[PDB]
Structure formats: structure tokens, C-alpha cells
Design a protein around this ligand. Structure first.
Ligand SMILES: C[C@@H](Oc1ccc(S(C)(=O)=O)cc1C(=O)N1C[C@@H]2C[C@]2(c2cc(C(F)(F)F)on2)C1)C(F)(F)F
Ligand SMILES: CC(C)CCC[C@@H](C)[C@H]1CC[C@H]2[C@@H]3CC=C4C[C@@H](O)CC[C@]4(C)[C@H]3CC[C@]12C
Ligand SMILES: CC(C)CCC[C@@H](C)[C@H]1CC[C@H]2[C@@H]3CC=C4C[C@@H](O)CC[C@]4(C)[C@H]3CC[C@]12C
Ligand SMILES: CC(C)CCC[C@@H](C)[C@H]1CC[C@H]2[C@@H]3CC=C4C[C@@H](O)CC[C@]4(C)[C@H]3CC[C@]12C
Ligand SMILES: [Cl-]
Ligand code: NA
Ligand code: NA
Length: 530
């Protein structure tokens, strides 16, 4: 609450790197209305539910499911999703390392078109064919990446990217064993890049495209599904680490205010970063003689094309570039540290024995080595196709499905009356009537309708937006299904060893709360728990 809401909880790579390119891909102004609609009704209530559920019983992601032991497969589905994110999230950081190390010059290498790697259609604003190209993304596409023409063309492994990835993983690991620039500063740099960028010629045309709604695309379930993914990704829902660090709070803590403040601050930061990004696109379209809708590419590297071009127009550009990329590195490292600490704690707690928890260093070393080896294919000539595949399939809508299943399990299996009496124990008042309504009828129905209309409107041979081959779509579907299949598969395991009779009483004996469910203190087990 105005202390940690700005040093973190709102600022990260999910606000300055993912939201701009998702918004640009999905239309720009046609993405804003579903974004706000699904923020108000479909993820402010769920953030509060997750925080209260974590804080009530002081348990992590696994072990909080004593409310209904049969549904423990929801906890394992968040570790599978977090494992996918933890692999490719540290490849975005190693790209920031590459730009940070390449800014230690007297002229920025992406400022002119006289470099040996530039084509004949380069066009800059400092110092023929069709569709003239800015110098900023030729550096990203022909020098940094050396992109190939297909996902099946592996090519050669890029040595500088591999070195930066190794450095990033070593830095992350060295802090797990032993252990300004947060709040204010991430906003000062953004304000500097925003004041310089609304004065340019053509910036207004990129702002109107960013805000003007398009009413012909509100009947598509794809846009609504993509808007739901970003809300849950940035807020941290269904990651698993939100419950773990909510369990350290005091019993009589006001998590309602914290949830509201954090949600609003995160939304404001995302929108402000979008304002910063979309002003540059208008200027690029103006001086390149193209339209704003087609000036750039709908890939995950929009932030590495627009941001370095803005820094080139500022006085003493290298000094600003160094600070910007150092800030990006720190922002990524904080989230990576949080995620890996949560994952290691969850792993050690489940396996816990006498040998384990005394060798926690070796588990941390094994996790870091395993995660470094899986990122090697993402540093080759076809590494951006794999990064886009794991960002659109592995963790896009599985988070929404898992959160919806958790909400349905808490309200309709445990009971809404019991949970409403539980919240009143922590706070002094019952939950607001708006939150009670947007917990039993609104959010589940909205998510259900989006999911149902996604598969009915499917099979157009068009929702495959990047023209991936046949096997890539199958691999993506396997990645997306490996996290939501942990929910029915664990239930089958639990139901095959629960003492009982034919499957009418075994269902009832497995969904009952455990004997040790409730507040985790003797002085707070008052009422229905004494
Ligand atoms: C829950 C995940 O956290 C984040 C998820 C996304 C972003 S993003 C897309 O905006 O870059 C930032 C954080 C993040 O770093 N957070 C730090 C701290 C866990 C988080 C948090 C903790 C709480 C609290 F209020 F419960 F304390 O509120 N937010 C969010 C995880 F912990 F697993 F990493
Ligand atoms: C041990 C876990 C935690 C992380 C692993 C860190 C190791 C594997 C890292 C640390 C620094 C890294 C090296 C740093 C620099 C280079 C130079 C580059 O031209 C080839 C890759 C290479 C040689 C990296 C390969 C892997 C490396 C040795
Ligand atoms: C088994 C029950 C409990 C859950 C339902 C699983 C199915 C129906 C859901 C869960 C996650 C969903 C997928 C998540 C992400 C994407 C990426 C998008 O580009 C195409 C649709 C696709 C592939 C979704 C289609 C349907 C999906 C596979
Ligand atoms: C596959 C993913 C999306 C999970 C699907 C579960 C959700 C979306 C479904 C399955 C069971 C359904 C609920 C079953 C019972 C009720 C009670 C009724 O008074 C209001 C509707 C409501 C609340 C339904 C709404 C949608 C629902 C919650
Ligand atoms: Cl966001
Ligand atoms: Na957050
Ligand atoms: Na952060």
C-alpha cells in the first residue's frame, strides 16, 4: 500500500515488454475495451480471493489445499506453468544484457545505416525499393538474431547470446544461495522517454490509433481471450507464488485495500508504458511512409525495436541507454529470484525428509543447471519462434482455466457461506456485495463463455496466426494441455485409494476439509474451529 506497490508488484517485464506487443498484435484500440472490462469483473475479485485464501491459512501453493484434498491437482498445475515461464523469462533478460554491454561505446550501433550489415532499403532520421526500413530493427533482425526463414531451420547457436544466458543464470544462482531503481526511477526514465516522443511529428496519429475503439472486433473470442491472459499474467494469478508470499502476512491484515491498490497501480503502469510505446510507432510510420497498423511486426521483439530508437534522439544517448537496460535487468532479476525461490521451496516441502532440507543448496544448483540447458535451443537462429511458441501456448489461457477452476472449487464445493464467514474472521466486515456477485455468477460465466466460443469459432485455418507448420501446433497444444491435465489426473489417483464404497461416497470423503484446516494459530481458532 503505497510502499511496495511501486517498488514492485506493478513494474516488471510483463508491463514494459509483453503488454505493448500484445496490444499492437491484437489491434491497438480494439484491445483496450476488453482489457478494462475483464480487469473490472474478471481479475480484481480473483486477486482478492487468492490473497485472502493464502493469508487465512498460513500455507503456500501446495498444502493450502486442505480445504478440499481432492483438488490438490490445481497446485501442481501452477508449478508446471511456472516451470515453463522460468525457462524463457531468463532469455529476455540475456537479451537485455546484450544491449547493456553494446551501449558502452561513443555512438550507438543502431543509429545509422552505414554499418556492414545494412541493406539498401535502410532509412534513418539522423545525420530504394518499397517498404523502407528503420536502422533499429535491422540491427535486431540481421545482427543480434540472424533470424532464419522457418522454425525447423535450427541454424547455428549464437555464442554471445549463450554467454549472456550463462552470465544471467550464474548471477541468479549466486543470489539464491547467499540471499531507488525500484519505484520512482522506473517512472522517471519512462517520463523522460514520454516527454521526448510526444513532441515528434506523427506521434498524435499513433495515440489516436491506440485509443479509438473498433466495434467490429468485439464479437471475436480471440481478442477477449488474449485480454484475459494479460490481466492474469501481470497480476500474478495462477503462477503459484502469489499464495506463497501472502502466507507470511498477519491474520488481521487488510488484504482488500492491498489488492485494490496493487491492481490499479499495475493497470496504470501498463497503460502508461503503452502510451510511451505507441508514440514512437506513429513517428516511425510518419517518416517511413507507411501506416501505423503495419509499420512493425507482430512479434515478441517490439520493445527491442521501438525503445532503442527513442533513446537515440535524447542528448548523450549512451548514458541513457546504460541506465535503461540496467533497469530492465534489475526488473527481470527480481521476478526471476521470486519465482525460483517459490519453486525451490515448493519442491523441498513436498519431498521433505531428514536428508532433504539439509541439502537445499544442491537442489538449487540442480534447478539452475536444468533451466540453463533448456534455454540453449532458444539462443539459436530460430530461437524467437520457440520463444513465441512458449509464450502463446504454454502460459496464455491455462492460467485463466486454473483460476476459474479454483474459484469454482472454493465457492461451490466448500461453500460460499463458509468462505464469507472466514473472511469476516480476518477483517471486521463481510466482503462487499460487488465481490460476492463477481464470485458466483459473473466471472465463471464470462470465462466459460469465452472458452466455449473459442473452440466453436475455431478450425478456420486462420487462428494459426504465424503460419507455423503442422508439428509446431501439435507441440504447442501438448504444452498447453500439460498443466490443465494435472487437475483430473490427480483426482483419479486420489479417488483410487480413498477408503469408501461405490463412487458416490468416495467423492464425499475426498472433498471434505482435512482435520487440520483453519487458521494456523491457537489464539485465532475461535468460532467454528474451537
Ligand atoms: C506471482 C509472481 O509475481 C509476479 C508476477 C508477474 C509480475 S509482472 C508480469 O508484473 O512483471 C511481477 C511479479 C512479482 O515480481 N511480484 C513480486 C511479488 C510476488 C508479487 C506480489 C506479492 C504480493 C502480496 F501483496 F501478496 F504481498 O503482491 N504481489 C508480485 C511470482 F511471484 F511468482 F513471481
Ligand atoms: C551453474 C549454473 C548455475 C549456471 C551455469 C553457468 C555456466 C554454465 C556459465 C557461466 C559463464 C558462461 C560462459 C560465459 C561466456 C562464454 C563465452 C561465449 O563465447 C561462449 C559461452 C561462454 C563460455 C559461457 C558458457 C556457460 C558459462 C560457463
Ligand atoms: C480438461 C479441462 C479441465 C480443461 C479444458 C482444456 C482445453 C479445452 C483448453 C485449456 C487451455 C486451452 C488452450 C490455451 C491456449 C491456446 C492458444 C490459442 O492460440 C489457441 C487455443 C489454445 C490452444 C486453447 C484452446 C483450448 C484449451 C486447450
Ligand atoms: C473449463 C473451465 C472454464 C472450468 C469450467 C467450470 C465453470 C466455468 C462452470 C462449470 C460449472 C458451472 C456452474 C454450475 C452451477 C452454477 C450454479 C448456478 O446457480 C449459477 C451458474 C453456475 C455457477 C455454473 C456456471 C459455470 C460453471 C462454474
Ligand atoms: Cl497488464
Ligand atoms: Na503483481
Ligand atoms: Na520487479
Amino acid at each position: 500500500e503505497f510502499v511496495l506497490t511501486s517498488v514492485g508488484y506493478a513494474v516488471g517485464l510483463g508491463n514494459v515488454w509483453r503488454f505493448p506487443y500484445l496490444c499492437y498484435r491484437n489491434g491497438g484500440g480494439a484491445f483496450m475495451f476488453p482489457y478494462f472490462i475483464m480487469l473490472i469483473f474478471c481479475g480484481i475479485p480473483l486477486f482478492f480471493m487468492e490473497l485472502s485464501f493464502g493469508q487465512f491459512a498460513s500455507q503456500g501453493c501446495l498444502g493450502v489445499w486442505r480445504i478440499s484434498p481432492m483438488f490438490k491437482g490445481v497446485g501442481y498445475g501452477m508449478m508446471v506453468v511456472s516451470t515453463y515461464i522460468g525457462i524463457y523469462y531468463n532469455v529476455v533478460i540475456c537479451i537485455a544484457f546484450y544491449y547493456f554491454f553494446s551501449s558502452m561505446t561513443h555512438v550507438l550501433p543502431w543509429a545509422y545505416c552505414n554499418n556492414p550489415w545494412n541493406t539498401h532499403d535502410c532509412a534513418g532520421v539522423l545525420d530504394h525499393s518499397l517498404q523502407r526500413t528503420s536502422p533499429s530493427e535491422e540491427y535486431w533482425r540481421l545482427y543480434v538474431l540472424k533470424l532464419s526463414d522457418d522454425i525447423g531451420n535450427f541454424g547455428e547457436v549464437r555464442l554471445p547470446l549463450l554467454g549472456c544466458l550463462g552470465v544471467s543464470w550464474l548471477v541468479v544462482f549466486l543470489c539464491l544461495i547467499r540471499g531507488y531503481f525500484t519505484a520512482t526511477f522506473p517512472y522517471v526514465v519512462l517520463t523522460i522517454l514520454f516527454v521526448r516522443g510526444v513532441t515528434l511529428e506523427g506521434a498524435f496519429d499513433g495515440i489516436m490509433y491506440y485509443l479509438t475503439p473498433q466495434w467490429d472486433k468485439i464479437l471475436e473470442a480471440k481478442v477477449w481471450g488474449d485480454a484475459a491472459s494479460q490481466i492474469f499474467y501481470s497480476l500474478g494469478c495462477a503462477w503459484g507464488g502469489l499464495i506463497t508470499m501472502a502466507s507470511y502476512n498477519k491474520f488481521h491484515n487488510n488484504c482488500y485495500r492491498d489488492s485494490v491498490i496493487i491492481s490499479i497501480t499495475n493497470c496504470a503502469t501498463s497503460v502508461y508504458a503503452g502510451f510511451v510505446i505507441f508514440s514512437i510507432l506513429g513517428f516511425m510510420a510518419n517518416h517511413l511512409g507507411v501506416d501505423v497498423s503495419r509499420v512493425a511486426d507482430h512479434g515478441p521483439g517490439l520493445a527491442f525495436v521501438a525503445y532503442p530508437e527513442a533513446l537515440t534522439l535524447l542528448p548523450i544517448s549512451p548514458l541513457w541507454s546504460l541506465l535503461f537496460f540496467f533497469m530492465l535487468i534489475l526488473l527481470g532479476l527480481g521476478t526471476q529470484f521470486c519465482l525460483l525461490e517459490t519453486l525451490v521451496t515448493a519442491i523441498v516441502d513436498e519431498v521433505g525428509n531428514e536428508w532433504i532440507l539439509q541439502k537445499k543448496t544442491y537442489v538449487t544448483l540442480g534447478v539452475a543447471v536444468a533451466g540453463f540447458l533448456l534455454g540453449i535451443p532458444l539462443t539459436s537462429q530460430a530461437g524467437i519462434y520457440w520463444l513465441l511458441l512458449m509464450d502463446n501456448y504454454a502460459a496464455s489461457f491455462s492460467l485463466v482455466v486454473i483460476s476459474c477452476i479454483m474459484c469454482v472449487a472454493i465457492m461451490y464445493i466448500y461453500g460460499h457461506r463458509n468462505y464469507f464467514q472466514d473472511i469476516q474472521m480476518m477483517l471486521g466486515f463481510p466482503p462487499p456485495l460487488f465481490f460476492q456477485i463477481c464470485w458466483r455468477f459473473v466471472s465463471p460465466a464470462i470465462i466459460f463463455f469465452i472458452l466455449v466460443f473459442t473452440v466453436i469459432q475455431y478450425q478456420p485455418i486462420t487462428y494459426n496466426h504465424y503460419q507455423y507448420p503442422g508439428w509446431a501446433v501439435a507441440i504447442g497444444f501438448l504444452m498447453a494441455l500439460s498443466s490443465v491435465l494435472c487437475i483430473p489426473l490427480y483426482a483419479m489417483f486420489r479417488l483410487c485409494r480413498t477408503d469408501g464404497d461405490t463412487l458416490l461416497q468416495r467423492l464425499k470423503n475426498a472433498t471434505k476439509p482435512s482435520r487440520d484446516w483453519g487458521p494456523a494459530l491457537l489464539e485465532h481458532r475461535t468460532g467454528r474451529y474451537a
